[PDB]
Write a protein that binds this ligand. Structure first.
Ligand SMILES: N#Cc1c(N)nc2ccccc2c1O[C@@H]1C=CCCC1
Ligand SMILES: [Mg+2]
Ligand SMILES: [Zn+2]
Length: 313
């Protein structure tokens, strides 16, 4: 009850910043997450015995892949924590509970392959879920871990609050499917500009929560350059392995995923920053002004990639 998590001074201060890196000590990541829940939600939101048991079952069900791993989970939850903390009064008690859990669970049991590679492989999950394949699996895995004896962190919610939080978590996880992001942001853009955006409209909140999920999910591009640059290697290690598996199915993969065309990476990152990241954090900053530091950090890193291309690094 009176048991708080406390971090060392440096972390205690840096954790509040959007660009915080959770560090290379795996065994500190659960405490960092519980720290964030206690400050974000309250020391009462979850029974600490059950939260700790949920966190360690979630960790167990992330694989040892180069990027879509436990570190990503906690990193993406931290970005959500930063957004929620800089936007105190915009979110309900249920939304703060749900979204941190959504982010921790959003890539559960990821194998390091796109929905595209599952479809071309003819993976069983591609037959069970025709669209947002992995994301439907991630939500499924979340519900399974919640239903293990002693793991129901939401037990003390009423029936309707329980239904609401699981529905917040389902939409949040589905939205991390980047194929759905383009349309979601376009719609949010129009609604913002025509002035029809309304946070009392549930369908509008859903869309805004989805953009938040994309923003947390891509938050590697909003870190200090050395973190951004080193994470990019982890992302590309998966892409190139997927490229390899495409070649095993007798399919030339797009040049981004082909490990013979590494030269093309910096230009590939420009496309990604201009086509995805900058638009994402632009619309997010328009809807939630205090998330501006994400857009700024993302612009700083675009410029750093421009410098890589111009031979300057
Ligand atoms: N972050 C990031 C990131 C990145 N730095 N670079 C990319 C380049 C091309 C396509 C996707 C890219 C990407 O997308 C996430 C990584 C893997 C799949 C989920 C979306
Ligand atoms: Mg994902
Ligand atoms: Zn992710």
């Amino acid at each position: 009850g009176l048991m708080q998590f406390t971090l060392p001074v440096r972390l205690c201060k840096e954790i509040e910043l959007f660009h915080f890196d959770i560090g290379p000590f795996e065994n500190m990541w659960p405490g960092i997450f519980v720290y964030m829940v206690h400050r974000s939600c309250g020391t009462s939101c979850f029974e600490l015995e059950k939260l700790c048991r949920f966190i360690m079952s979630v960790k167990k069900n992330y694989r040892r892949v180069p990027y879509h791993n436990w570190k990503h989970a906690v990193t993406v939850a931290h970005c959500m924590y930063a957004i929620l903390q800089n936007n105190h009064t915009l979110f309900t008690d249920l939304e703060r509970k749900g979204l941190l859990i959504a982010c921790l669970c959003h890539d559960l049991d990821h194998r390091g392959f796109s929905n595209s590679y599952l479809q071309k492989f003819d993976h069983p999950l591609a037959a069970l879920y025709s669209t947002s394949t992995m994301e439907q699996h991630h939500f499924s895995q979340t519900v399974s871990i919640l239903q293990l004896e002693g793991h129901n962190i939401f037990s003390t919610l009423s029936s309707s609050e329980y239904e609401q939080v699981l529905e917040i978590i389902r939409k949040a996880i589905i939205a991390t499917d980047l194929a759905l992001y383009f349309g979601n942001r376009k719609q949010l853009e129009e609604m913002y500009q025509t002035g029809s955006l309304n946070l009392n409209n549930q369908s509008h909140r859903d869309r805004v929560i989805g953009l938040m999920m994309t923003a947390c999910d891509l938050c590697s591009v909003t870190k200090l350059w050395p973190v951004t640059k080193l994470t990019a290697n982890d992302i590309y290690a998966e892409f190139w392995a997927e490229g390899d598996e495409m070649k095993k199915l007798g399919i030339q993969p797009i040049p981004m995923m082909d490990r013979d065309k590494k030269d093309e990476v910096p230009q590939g990152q420009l496309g990604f920053y201009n086509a995805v990241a900058i638009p994402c954090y632009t619309t997010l900053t328009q809807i939630l002004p205090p998330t501006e530091p994400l857009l700024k950090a993302c612009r700083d890193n675009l410029s750093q990639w421009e410098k890589v291309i111009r031979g300057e690094e």
